Symmetry: D3
């Protein structure tokens, strides 16, 4: 039950690729949570609609994301999808995006951040960043695995369909298991 | 003994959080130092800073490069130093005027003095902080937790010790004690 | 709320540096905890700890492994934590009984409490200290500079906050403030 | 192929845990490889020395020649404890197995690891991923062996060791490298 | 044999600094390689030499993965900032993205290092890369041991040789040289 | 001027590895310095070391601790420095008399001088070498590739330059050039 919970939802990467996450905002709000959308960019139909579904303007600036620390604290922050670029910057404590600042404002309070990974270098250079996050207080992952062991050997991507189950567990300070899965047979 | 030194003064983050350093520029100059302002953003308080110091603020990465070969600083100060810029500094990125200024200073084996201020200092930013603490020619204004219940992972320098810190750094020494109870110095 | 908890207690470094923790052992038992000592080395200091506590000290890596599946700790304490052991713990090495016990505890997602003592805390050991601070289920007894002039990079825990530290740890919390002016409690 | 290849085989951790990598060791030799055992330190050692025709390298000094004088074609380490995996990623050499692997990387030759640690998704995650990304290092496919009882634990599928070696000899990582280990217990 | 290979060529840093690699782009084409310019931002001339548009956006760089795979991605010069970003797996420029899209496929990236903090804070980054799969360096060293003690810069004149060896999965040796004697 | 300076000299790795550094104790002593030997293990080429200088070689971690508060060094030399010891030193481990002596030296803010020698300097040990290069009070005897084709990842110090290195390190300076074509000085 995330009824009564304030849940942040950040988007990173490419405008169009956010099709799959829509039903998830739908489910969250349907299940009783208040959702605050955060976007890493200041027309956009995708976002045009996101503000419709839930009853809040998209936080789209770093300064707009700051109040999530002291003024409007989240019970959980979600980032999906989480690009390789943003994962790297998050693991390093950078905050040059509204979505990262929202993450940081959330960890500020010792509250959970839920990540849905999606990067073609997860088993290359981004591997260390991934595992640093996995090991960090208050950070949880949507179960993930390789999505294309032949076509993209270093690629790992989350099972989005498990996002809600992951949030529910993170709200209890727990990582949903199994967190490492053969993603490639749920394509 | 800041007297005659060429001192860079960079600042990162929100603008309004800067009146804590406005009087510091004034201190440094009253002390005889030559102060070169560096702004990580390309706002009139800037022309005020520029009148105080007698130099146009450096406000581009290219305007900062000459701080290396042409006009070398005796010390580079960054204050406040945000978590974002601290992480970038620790990783040797230079995508801002202030970071490039700091780099052009370490290029010459010269001191860089940092005043930390981030709410993730004892979270993900901790390793960045300590990497810098351990690094040649980098010094910290003494710092600590400013709000252990409200912001448990937060650490912030005692700005008032800024001048004392750069005085020690010009001699290549870290001002001690460097780790302090910052929350005991919130109302000066 | 130490009552009915199984508490691991590990010692690292020279043996001569333990009189300052013995009393803390007895406070834990008085509070109703079952304490399992483990020593990083196979006098009375050993016989005593075993007398006080109700158990033979675990003194081998094989001896510590069952802290995982058979006798799981509710919390594992390491005081003092030498700089050597801190660095190895942070790097996930287990070449001592204490390190292995600590691993066996994190295995179960249970809290490990550390009381740092090293003269390079602000030097090369700093990153290791801060990696741990950031890590799931690891807690520090509040610590700070013990001798800022004579030992500039040195930091040491306030041993007297040990029990309070484990109490918060048992709830998944870091005792605050965790960074203190250790040199005033000398 | 494996035929003719000189394959070092390093064991780390408790001697008991070794009776599950014997058949794979036996498989390598049935395939034409010479298997040169090296041990971090008995009855079990003799069986391994008897199966392969070679006395195990058991000292740091006996492992050094593996660089300049008698280089292998591939070095396998199985099982790889969390302790040894950490030291390996950090370039320590205080055991025959670790020295042997360093002497193999010395020459740009492949090192194949079969991981086995209850902290792979804890503190040791960084180390595993450092190795994953490093030149000439390969992993036998691995994953969680017990998601609820040992949430941070990961362990290789030993049955894929020969296929991992085969790919490593071609400078390739056998794919997929991330598997649901717990579905093959 | 650059013969028939598709070689990506990314540039980072200041605009004017490029006079050094421009004849190299020429050597590559004369060796029979198809060269795709990538810019983190003279340009025209390169597009004239190369016959290809400069990829100048991150989205323009993504196709280098699935559709137009490179056989080699070259970055020269490689600034300290870009090297750090690259080592940390960031992709906030066309060039970094091109590099990622190349390592995506297990293909070589060749780096020509140029930074005054190489023996400073960037040192760890440089060594992370040196040890990483599919990354090769044109040999480099201190260009000015007294004037810029922490500085290291590649020997550009060795770029082609580096690219040749990388195609074979090899690092050109010696990779550590006294740059200052060829300055 | 090594005259009047107390300088620690630690040895790591194989035993026979010291047909090289014998003249160095000699040169240092001749230069008017007090040399304190420390040995990573507690054929008496070592009896001569304790002979050349008038001190028993520190051979235990405990014998090394006093190098901190009681008999501080002006400089600690480690030559040669194996890849194992280099990694341990970079990671702040102290499980040898030589590592403990170096830690007791950095304790006081004093220079440590390192003569690298490892076949994985350009492999996994690269990151450790560079962490050290960048750290306060750590200096290197100039080093480079000793055999680019034979051992592509190997780097080794120019031992001939050891004294000039300590002399600079005493003044808080790193001797330049620090990166050299070592393969040219093999004769």
């Amino acid at each position: 039950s995330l009824k009564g919970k304030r849940i942040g939802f950040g988007f990173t990467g490419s405008h169009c690729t956010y099709e799959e996450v829509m039903p998830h905002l739908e489910k969250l709000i349907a299940e009783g949570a208040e959702v605050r959308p955060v976007v890493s960019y200041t027309g956009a139909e995708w976002i045009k609609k996101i503000e419709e579904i839930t009853g809040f303007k998209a936080i789209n600036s770093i300064v707009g994301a700051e109040p999530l620390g002291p003024k409007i604290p989240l019970d959980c922050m979600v980032i999906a999808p989480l690009t390789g670029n943003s994962m790297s910057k998050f693991a390093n404590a950078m905050t040059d995006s509204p979505v990262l600042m929202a993450a940081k404002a959330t960890l500020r309070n010792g509250k959970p951040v839920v990540l849905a990974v999606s990067t073609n270098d997860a088993l290359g250079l981004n591997g260390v960043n991934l595992m640093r996050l996995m090991a960090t207080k208050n950070i949880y992952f949507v179960p993930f695995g390789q999505d294309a062991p032949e076509k993209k050997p270093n690629s790992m991507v989350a099972r989005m369909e498990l996002l809600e189950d992951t949030v529910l567990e993170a709200l209890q300070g727990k990582q949903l298991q199994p967190v490492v899965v053969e993603k490639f047979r749920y394509m």
